[PDB]
Design a protein around this ligand. Structure first.
Ligand code: 04C
Ligand code: CL
Ligand code: CL
Ligand code: CL
Ligand code: CL
Ligand code: CL
Ligand code: CL
Ligand code: CL
Ligand code: CL
Ligand code: CL
Ligand code: CL
Ligand code: CL
Ligand code: CL
Ligand code: CL
Ligand code: CL
Ligand code: CL
Ligand code: CL
Ligand code: CL
Ligand code: CL
Ligand code: CL
Ligand code: K
Ligand code: K
Ligand code: K
Ligand code: K
Ligand code: K
Lengths: 238, 233, 238, 213, 216, 248, 201, 230
């Protein structure tokens, strides 16, 4: 077996390998999640598909369990490993314990997995950050995010990838009850914050929404383009 | 390029000294050992008002009578904390009693320099933990506070601070400590020193406060209770 | 230097630098003194504080009813060696029901400490020990180092400024064999005192004592239990 | 084939009072219809506060006492204190259960004081099921020792006795009496009776001769 | 060992004033058959402790070599330390129980005689790990035949001179020869004292067969 | 020891993996390999790099592998690494069959090998497989499918794509010509020969230099054929005859 | 042993006997067969004593870790499922343990029966031990969802007491608990034979 | 005591080239020349066995080796490395026979042997083989000739050469080799391709040649080689 320490401390006290993995996520496609009142919605971008490529395959919104879904940014090949490890863990928590996974627990596992890859021999850290969206069994909405280091926090709204600094700053200015009042305006809030950084066009936007008790919904490029119309009718006018 | 178990000409392990440096980037945490209890306090370091307040947990519960303040690489700490929690419950199972604060700290200190490359397991450690820990609690030797760093070295403290502003808070505790301090003055002092060494103003949602006193168990402070101790500035 | 990163690399002069670098770790720790009479073996060590608010470090540790140690160097390497010594003493009592002779225990350290100096990826033990014990052959004072080498000594000092203590004992080594226990400890304290700067002297907070012999099992006196020995002090001269 | 067990007899008794604990046993070691030795007391000092009594297969009892001895030292180096009576009893339960599928043919009773200075007694089975109680007997003659203690110490089956608290003096005679009775009926009980008294002062041993047939 | 092949019968032990004396006959049986009538079942461990062994002879010879090497190893260090009779007894107890617990026992019963620090030592070791100390010892059929004799004398006279112990032992070997079908009339006496271990050559107990004429 | 370690599974300062990107360069120097998806089928077309008067032609193909009853792939890169992966692809396919008693869905088989290739970039300290793969097949869920595999362990579903030499030129050539939802297998076969002819090195094109395999659904059975030499000859010449009708 | 538990409008009540038997002999008559895991979890014991003690304490050990990790306490469903899984690791090795898990989580009042075999079922009523059939008879004859705390205390008391009268291996005392919305409260430790004389007028 | 290196000694350079494989190719390109010719009714394999001294016993070691009854081997490159591959080839041939009770198809042996070669281009602490293999065989009434090389890649040949002057030997064969030879003709054109790269005078001791047909595979005796040397 390969027993070399890959991730080690620098003289200044830096984990370069973990920091390089954070450079990989910053090169990743724009991903934004926001918690509403009744629903939670994710949105993912920098899609840039050749239109010669079938896009059903390159979808960055993944469901981990019945009540949990996630979005990622960075090395998409790494993400697939993490996602399927989390999917296996979702079914094991269901076998060891009757209860379905809490959002915080699955986030904690994914975080513990990434952390383990920063302190174990023979392996490099994962090159992805995750945004985890789900509902509690009591119904209170939950949004979390992780990074290559292994740290996780809960967010009201957040962005990762390229244009994260730009979109994040937008969310701080635009996150009030006037925007969260309805279910429609929260979806609109994602699209607006999304269309704010991407090479414009609702054709490059795949976003998912899930209501308190409803199964996960991936939206029609019809439904989202209908909302892109309510932004352009209220952009030249407003 | 060298190995992880290499000695400096000085006489220290590089990876350990570098792990000490990683803590100097972590948010500051203070513990105070009062004759009538132990108080732990830490700054959260909010990066955005979008981040959830109670989401960051830099002071956690290990046992009914033990609290742990953490600084440095948070992700490294929570692996060590689970190990601390596992040890207490293994000990409870085997001996039907609560562990001493010294033994709990000693248990975590055993994982110290258990890292390496060759002549090791597949899942053996590649590096040390970029974390410092303050174990504060009450056992049959009264109230106690212990400090631990990546060298494995652990020692009791009457009062200690660790993090980015370590020396500044250390001097502030030095001239403001009586071994006869009350718990009212203990929480106050930690709150007074915290605002001085920080880049952000002290809010009720900005910090975590914890008490372990003989009578009652480890307690996580609620926002309303924080507003009563921040009332006396 | 390129002959000094691994223990498995010999210097052209015919030396191993990584052993010598580990030997430096011993010298940086606070001083500790071991001496013996025909009946007793006494350890005297200087506790150190990083700050005045923190307590003093433990210097003297229990091994068995008839064996005790004082440490100098890395804490974890000291704790690891202490646990090996304890385990060896336990196995000896478990199997033979009689205490493990001091000579043989030290020989086991000499054999164990040698292993890591000869394997790649391993490192020497960053601690030196002073071992005080009592067996069929009377009292013993032993010395171990990062190099697997060990010595049987009439008296010894290791740590910072241990040269001063070493010279004190060297003058009075013929004195010890007919010494009363109270006179023996004062000799140990007087040597430890020489290590300190002229401004400061031995206090009840910074002095630790370990005693084993014909009369009693190994005992550690620390704070209030230490002042009987300090009181009755010939004054610090120059 | 080959049997890993032998039966060596021995009965052990423990009683708890306000500030004392009593652990008592016969001194007979036997095998088949022969006596191995007449000088084999089953009581053993672990700490100044706690005493153990083991009976059954002597090979198991010997190795188990040595495991406990080593484990006591391991605890004190690690925790910087002595293992309490309750802690030893808790540890013994786990040690015995680690052999659930190849058990120690052993009957252990723990006698000492709790942290409040009060008398404590712990009774075990070969596999580690245990609890605290005022009085318990284990071994080949335990069924002979039990009912008399149930009646006199527990005040069972009685109508207008005033329920006098247990004294050291009375318990001492009680311990002596039940063994005198058992030595008359049980062939594995005899020779001598050793009583270990645990108090705040420490462990005091006492010997009273028994039937040698 | 699951089934022992060549076995030895009872080993005798009793401690006199200033030492211990051990007896065992020079027979190795293969079932009922007397196979080897001139083999030693006793050894000198060192100058303070000695050992006689019942049961499987191959297991005894194995334990003889392991103990033999342990003494050599200790003599090499020359650190003023040596194994006491109690230390050998404790080791042997730990060895037997360990082998027994792995369901692969050393098929032996042992008597360990010794003299150290002005005190006489006599210890019993079983194949199951049963261990204790007694003033007199007898294994196998000796426990039923010789042990009653020894106890009845030691009750009347606790301290014996070396001569008294010797003649008591010879008397016991007489009983064993008469009554044990797995015994023989060739035996050895081992002795520990201030001077060390002394094993004496082939001995025969005096027999009388005059009761062969008392059946009419 | 660590003196000799090339540190293959390690991060670069920019946040990228060197060995993976260096493996990408190896693909560029290998044969041009294209896949095109049609309405009534899907095909692979690849440049033969093993060409000589003295080669024996024993196997049906050089770069086309049958993996499954309903799936075939084509390869570009180091052929030994390709053989290792294709044999493994055949194994994963059979394990799924053994377990479920129905053929493995196209995407799933690709995903499985990609997980192995990705594992080689993260742990083990080994060099990655210097191979890109083009998968074509039919399953009962998504019908006719085409997939692309990177040495990174990353995959994507395509309607038309290419890997190997002059790859970027070949795809932009396809990007103009490919008629989405209107492509028949006859149209896709003609496009393949067109893209190859412009992309290839020796210029005139030959039935010894190209390899074409078609995957069709016929009579409720998935039929896979590697096109015969007489067939490739007519495919090249039909493009040649149209190259003579392009002037006046 | 005899062990019983049932739920009604005001929570769940739990009653056990206190006899320990070795062969035909009563080893202990003051044996505690309820384990108080947390303030609102409760475990009963039946079968091999050392098996019960160890394994339900090991469940308790893990219910402790769950609370310290998740910081939110463990559900009843989770606990009983975890125990069933521990039992399943030691399959066909001769562990004899019959236990009922009681508690209050968000789902309301939770009652569960776990076997040494791995069997695990939720329900309104359960009874384990050598005297379960007797405990069942008196339980069913005099049960309704509309019991008051006093009626339920009467029933559980009655059920153990009557079971201990017919069962050779049940006796000692009745130990009863009331599982309320804000945790269990221990009702009584009443002598079995004393009740049987009271019920005999 | 020891434990091997776990990292690859063959990695990708920025150019996308596995340098150690190309460096292994240089080892074979500098070895003694070897030629194989598929000849309609059989196969021939010949090599330069010039030990460059009269002190050697020419009969002691062989370069043309039998793998089984119907398969043979020659090499250009390192002799010691080749021996490893021969031993591995013989075992694989037997492993196949034991399972299927049928002589291993030459194509299947070559694939299995080529996979072993691939391992040493990726496995830790090892260098690739510095040998290229020429494997002949007869199965299903058809002659086969294959080339395996350090890469783990394998090729099928009508005729080819390797080692010293492999480029000149190849062009010679292009012009000289025609399909539908008789086997005895192929031995001539094999020895002729060998003469192009020789340097010295050819005796039956200087060169080694094996043949494969429907009757199996055998190495020609020194007396047989002399009769073709005219
Ligand atoms: C009633 C009294 C009927 O037995 C209960 O089931 C009670 C359960 C219980 C639970 C926790 C605390 C106390 C009591 N069971 C027992 O009293 C139990 C009976 C039993 C014996 C063996 C079994 O396995 C086949 C199953 C049930 N008694 C014991 O567990 C006793 C204390 N243990 C032993 O006798 C130990 N043996 C096992 C092997 O070694 C020799 C002795
Ligand atoms: Cl599973
Ligand atoms: Cl892992
Ligand atoms: Cl980011
Ligand atoms: Cl250090
Ligand atoms: Cl620090
Ligand atoms: Cl040196
Ligand atoms: Cl240190
Ligand atoms: Cl020194
Ligand atoms: Cl009293
Ligand atoms: Cl002999
Ligand atoms: Cl025997
Ligand atoms: Cl052993
Ligand atoms: Cl004894
Ligand atoms: Cl290649
Ligand atoms: Cl690995
Ligand atoms: Cl390695
Ligand atoms: Cl060779
Ligand atoms: Cl095969
Ligand atoms: Cl041949
Ligand atoms: K090293
Ligand atoms: K068994
Ligand atoms: K019992
Ligand atoms: K005899
Ligand atoms: K237990």
């Amino acid at each position: 077996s390969y027993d070399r320490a890959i991730t080690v401390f620098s003289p200044d006290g830096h984990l370069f390998q973990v920091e390089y993995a954070q450079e990989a996520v910053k090169k990743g496609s724009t991903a934004v999640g926001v918690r509403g009142k009744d629903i939670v919605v994710l949105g993912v971008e920098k899609k840039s598909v050749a239109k010669l490529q079938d896009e059903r395959t390159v979808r960055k919104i993944c469901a981990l369990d019945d009540n949990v879904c996630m979005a990622f940014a960075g090395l998409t090949a790494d993400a697939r490993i993490v996602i399927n490890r989390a999917r296996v863990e979702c079914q094991s928590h269901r076998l060891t314990v009757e209860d379905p996974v809490t959002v915080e627990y699955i986030t904690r596992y994914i975080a513990s997995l990434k952390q383990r890859y920063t302190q174990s021999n023979g392996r490099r850290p994962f090159g992805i950050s995750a945004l985890i969206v789900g509902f509690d069994f009591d119904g209170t909405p939950r949004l979390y995010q992780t990074d290559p280091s292994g740290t996780y926090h809960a967010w009201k709204a957040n962005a990762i990838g390229r244009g994260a600094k730009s979109v994040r700053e937008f969310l701080e200015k635009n996150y009030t009850d006037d925007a969260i009042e309805t279910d429609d305006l929260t979806i609109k809030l994602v699209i607006k914050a999304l269309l704010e950084v991407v090479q414009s066009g609702g054709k490059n936007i795949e976003l998912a929404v899930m209501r308190r008790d409803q199964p996960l919904k991936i939206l029609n490029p019809e439904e989202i383009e209908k909302y892109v119309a309510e932004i352009e009718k209220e952009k030249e006018e407003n | 390029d060298r190995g992880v178990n290499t000695f400096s000409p000085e006489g220290r392990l590089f990876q350990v000294e570098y792990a000490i440096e990683a803590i100097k980037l972590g948010s500051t945490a203070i513990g105070i050992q009062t004759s009538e209890g132990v108080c732990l306090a830490v700054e959260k370091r909010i990066t955005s008002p979008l981040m959830e307040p109670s989401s960051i947990e830099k002071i956690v519960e290990i046992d009914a009578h033990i609290g742990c303040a953490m600084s440095g690489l948070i992700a490294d700490a929570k692996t060590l904390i689970d190990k601390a929690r596992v040890e207490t419950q293994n000990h409870w199972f085997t001996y039907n009693e609560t562990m001493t604060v010294e033994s709990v700290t000693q248990a975590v200190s055993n994982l110290a320099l258990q890292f390496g490359e060759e002549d090791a397991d597949p899942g053996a450690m590649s590096r040390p933990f970029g974390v410092a820990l303050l174990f504060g609690g009450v056992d049959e030797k009264g109230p106690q506070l212990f400090h631990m760093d990546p060298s494995g070295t652990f020692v009791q403290c009457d009062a200690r601070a660790i993090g980015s502003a370590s020396e500044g808070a250390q001097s502030s505790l030095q001239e403001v400590y009586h071994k006869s301090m009350t718990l009212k003055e203990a929480i106050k002092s930690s709150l007074i020193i915290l605002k001085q060494v920080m880049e952000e103003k002290l809010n009720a949602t900005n910090i975590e406060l914890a008490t372990v006193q003989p009578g009652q168990n480890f307690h996580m402070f609620t926002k309303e209770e924080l507003e009563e101790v921040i009332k006396d500035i | 230097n390129q002959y000094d990163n691994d223990v498995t690399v010999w210097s052209p002069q015919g030396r191993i630098h990584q052993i010598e670098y580990a030997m430096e770790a011993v010298k940086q720790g606070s001083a500790t003194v071991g001496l013996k009479s025909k009946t007793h073996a006494v350890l005297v060590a200087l506790k150190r504080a990083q700050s005045e608010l923190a307590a003093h470090q433990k210097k003297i540790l229990h091994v068995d009813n008839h064996i005790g140690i004082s440490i100098a160097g890395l804490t974890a390497d000291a704790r690891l060696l202490c646990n090996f010594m304890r385990q060896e003493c336990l196995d000896s009592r478990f199997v033979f029901d009689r205490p493990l002779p001091v000579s043989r225990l030290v020989s086991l350290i000499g054999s164990k400490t040698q292993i890591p100096t000869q394997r790649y990826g391993r490192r020497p033990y960053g601690v030196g020990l002073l071992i005080a014990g009592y067996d069929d052959m009377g009292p013993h004072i032993f010395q171990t180092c990062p190099s697997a080498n060990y010595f049987d000594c009439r008296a010894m000092s290791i740590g910072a400024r241990s040269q001063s203590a070493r010279t004190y004992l060297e003058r009075h080594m013929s004195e010890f064999m007919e010494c009363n226990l109270d006179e023996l400890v004062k000799h140990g304290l007087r040597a430890l005192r020489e290590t300190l700067p002229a401004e400061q002297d031995l206090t009840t907070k910074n002095v630790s004592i370990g005693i084993v012999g014909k009369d009693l099992e190994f005992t550690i006196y620390d704070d209030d239990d230490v002042s009987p020995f300090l009181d009755g002090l010939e004054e610090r001269p120059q | 084939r080959f049997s890993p067990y032998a039966f060596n007899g021995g009965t052990v008794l423990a009683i708890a009072g306000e500030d004392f604990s009593i652990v008592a046993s016969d001194t007979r070691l036997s095998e088949g219809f022969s006596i191995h030795t007449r000088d084999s007391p089953k009581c053993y000092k672990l700490t100044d506060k706690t005493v153990i009594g083991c009976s059954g297969f002597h090979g198991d009892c010997l190795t188990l006492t040595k495991i406990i001895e080593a484990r006591l030292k391991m605890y004190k180096h690690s925790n910087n204190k002595a293992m309490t009576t309750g802690a030893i009893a808790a540890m013994l339960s786990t040690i015995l259960y680690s052999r659930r599928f190849f058990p120690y043919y052993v009957y252990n009773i723990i006698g000492g004081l709790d942290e409040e200075g009060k008398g404590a007694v712990y009774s075990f089975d070969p596999v580690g099921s245990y609890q605290r109680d005022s009085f318990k007997a284990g071994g080949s003659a335990s069924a002979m020792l039990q009912p008399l203690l149930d009646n006199q110490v527990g005040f069972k089956n009685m109508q207008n006795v005033e329920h006098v608290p247990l004294t050291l003096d009375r318990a001492m005679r009680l311990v002596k009496d039940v063994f005198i009775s058992a030595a008359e009926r049980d062939v594995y009980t005899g020779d001598a009776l050793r009583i270990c008294i645990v108090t705040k002062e420490g462990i005091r041993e006492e010997t009273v001769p028994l039937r040698k047939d | 060992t699951q089934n022992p092949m060549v076995t030895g019968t009872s080993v005798l032990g009793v401690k006199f004033d200033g030492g211990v004396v051990i007896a065992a006959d020079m027979l190795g049986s293969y079932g009922s058959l007397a196979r080897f009538r001139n083999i030693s079942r006793i050894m000198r461990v060192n100058d303070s402790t000695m050992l006689g062994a019942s049961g499987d002879y191959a297991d005894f010879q194995y334990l003889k070599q392991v103990l033999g090497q342990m003494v050599i190893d200790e003599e090499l260090l020359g650190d003023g330390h040596s194994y006491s009779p109690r230390a050998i007894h404790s080791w042997l107890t730990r060895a037997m129980y360990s082998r027994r617990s792995k369901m692969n026992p050393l098929w032996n019963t042992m008597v360990i005689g010794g003299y150290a620090d002005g005190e006489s030592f006599l210890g019993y070791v079983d194949m199951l790990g049963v261990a204790y100390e007694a003033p007199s010892l007898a294994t196998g059929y000796g426990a039923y035949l010789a042990q009653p004799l020894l106890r009845e004398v030691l009750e009347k006279q606790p301290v014996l001179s070396q001569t008294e112990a010797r003649e008591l032992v010879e008397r016991c070997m007489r009983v064993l020869y008469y009554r044990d079908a797995r015994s023989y009339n060739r035996f050895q006496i081992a002795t520990v004292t201030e001077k060390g271990v002394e094993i004496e050559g082939p001995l025969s107990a005096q027999t009388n067969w005059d009761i062969a004429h008392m059946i009419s | 020891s660590r003196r000799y370690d090339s540190r293959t599974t390690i991060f670069s300062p920019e946040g990228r993996l060197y060995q993976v990107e260096y493996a990408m360069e190896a693909i560029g120097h290998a044969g041009t390999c294209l896949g095109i998806l049609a309405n009534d089928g899907v095909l692979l077309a690849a440049e033969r790099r093993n060409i000589h008067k003295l080669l024996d032609e024993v196997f049906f193909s050089e770069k086309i592998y049958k993996l499954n009853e309903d799936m075939a792939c084509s390869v570009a890169g180091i052929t030994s690494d390709a053989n290792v992966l294709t044999n493994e692809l055949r194994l994963i396919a059979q394990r799924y069959l053994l377990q479920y008693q129905e053929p493995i869905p196209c995407e799933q088989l690709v995903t499985a090998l990609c997980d192995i290739k990705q594992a080689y970039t993260q742990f083990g300290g080994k060099r990655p497989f210097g191979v890109s793969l083009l998968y074509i097949g039919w399953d009962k869920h998504y019908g006719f499918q085409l997939y692309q595999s990177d040495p990174s362990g990353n995959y994507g579903g395509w309607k038309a794509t290419c890997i190997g030499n002059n790859s970027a030129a070949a795809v932009s050539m396809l990007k103009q010509d490919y008629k989405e939802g209107e492509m028949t297998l006859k149209s896709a076969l003609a496009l393949a020969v067109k893209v190859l002819n412009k992309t290839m090195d020796v210029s005139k094109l030959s039935a010894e230099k190209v390899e074409i395999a078609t995957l069709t659904r016929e009579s409720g059975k998935t039929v896979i054929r590697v096109l015969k030499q007489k067939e490739v000859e007519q495919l090249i010449k039909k493009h040649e005859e149209e190259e003579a009708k392009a002037e006046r | 042993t005899t062990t019983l538990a049932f739920k009604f409008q005001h929570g769940v009540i739990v009653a056990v006997d206190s006899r320990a038997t070795a062969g035909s002999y009563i080893s202990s008559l003051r044996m505690n067969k309820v384990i108080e895991i947390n303030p609102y979890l409760l475990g009963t014991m039946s079968g091999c004593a050392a098996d019960c003690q160890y394994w339900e304490r090991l469940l308790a050990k893990e219910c402790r870790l769950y609370y310290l990790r998740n910081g939110e306490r463990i559900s009843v469903s989770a606990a009983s499922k975890l125990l069933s899984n521990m039992m399943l690791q030691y399959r066909g090795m001769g562990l004899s343990m019959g236990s009922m898990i009681c508690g209050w989580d968000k789902k309301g009042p939770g009652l569960y029966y776990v076997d040494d075999n791995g069997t695990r079922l939720s329900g309104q009523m359960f009874s384990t031990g050598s005297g379960n059939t007797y405990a069942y008879g008196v339980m069913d004859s005099g049960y309704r969802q509309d019991l008051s705390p006093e009626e339920a205390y009467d029933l559980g008391r009655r059920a153990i007491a009557y079971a201990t009268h017919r069962d050779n291996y049940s006796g000692g005392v009745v130990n009863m608990y009331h599982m309320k919305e804000d945790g269990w409260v221990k009702v009584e430790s009443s002598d079995v034979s004393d009740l049987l004389y009271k019920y005999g007028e | 005591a020891k434990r091997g290196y776990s990292f690859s000694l063959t990695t990708f350079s920025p150019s996308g080239k596995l340098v150690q494989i190309e460096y292994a190719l240089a080892a074979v390109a500098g070895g003694a020349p070897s030629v194989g010719i598929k000849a309609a009714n059989g196969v021939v394999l010949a090599t330069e066995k010039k030990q460059k001294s009269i002190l050697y016993d020419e009969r002691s070691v062989h370069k043309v080796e039998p793998i089984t009854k119907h398969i043979g081997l020659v090499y250009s490159g390192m002799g010691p490395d080749y021996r490893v591959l021969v031993h591995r080839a013989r075992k694989l041939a037997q492993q196949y026979y034991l399972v299927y009770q049928e002589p291993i198809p030459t194509a299947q042996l070559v694939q299995r042997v080529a996979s072993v070669m691939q391992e040493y281009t990726q496995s830790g602490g090892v260098r690739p083989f510095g040998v290229s293999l020429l494997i002949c065989g007869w199965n299903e009434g058809r002659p086969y000739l294959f080339q395996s090389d350090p890469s783990g890649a394998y090729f099928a040949w009508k005729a080819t050469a390797m080692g010293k002057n492999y480029v000149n030997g190849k062009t010679f064969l292009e012009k000289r080799y025609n399909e539908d030879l008789e086997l005895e003709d192929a031995i001539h054109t094999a020895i002729l391709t060998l003469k192009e790269s020789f340097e010295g005078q050819m005796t039956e001791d200087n060169i080694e040649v094996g043949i494969c047909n429907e009757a199996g595979f055998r190495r020609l005796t020194p007396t047989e080689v002399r009769d073709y040397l005219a």
